[PDB]
Amino acid sequence: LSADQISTVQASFDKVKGDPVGILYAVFKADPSIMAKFTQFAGKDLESIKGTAPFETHANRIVGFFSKIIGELPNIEADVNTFVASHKPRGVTHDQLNNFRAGFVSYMKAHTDFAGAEAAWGATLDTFFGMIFSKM
Ligand code: HEM
What we know:
Elements: H1 3-14, H2 20-30, H3 32-35, H4 46-49, H5 53-71, H6 77-87, H7 94-111, H8 118-135
Helix pairs in contact: 1-8, 2-5, 2-7, 6-8
The protein binds protoporphyrin IX containing FE.
PDB class: oxygen transport
Keywords: oxygen transport
Assembly: monomeric
């Protein structure tokens, strides 16, 4: 993960970072068991809560932190540590994490011309999820 790839990803992310709700929707849609961990969304129709204020609040926090991480590549260790601290005790599994990844990439493919940033994103996400999976 070098500056060339980092600059590519960050340019790519800048195009979509204003749509937190869209990104979280794509993740929840890829894996409903992620949605079922939120007391505020469990048992509801995803298509119906997508436009409500609670969804947006959550989406802004979650994609907000991801944004922090993308902004500081590649010095992400301390933030991954924080993520693991808050999420390890909620029982998040490797499956769910990989579905988060899949949902995000699906979002990125359906909203941008992704083919030009795909290898850089691959490097980034392999690095990030590589660190998470070593810790939880
Ligand atoms: C994919 C599996 C994941 C599951 C099952 C999960 C689950 C949750 C749950 C249950 C909450 C608490 C919401 C609330 O009580 O209001 C939450 C909050 C949060 N999540 Fe995750 N999350 C996942 C992935 C991620 C990822 C990849 C990030 C990185 C951006 C992230 C960042 C956050 C942040 C910043 C919060 C707010 C602070 C907190 O309460 O932890 N989550 N998530």
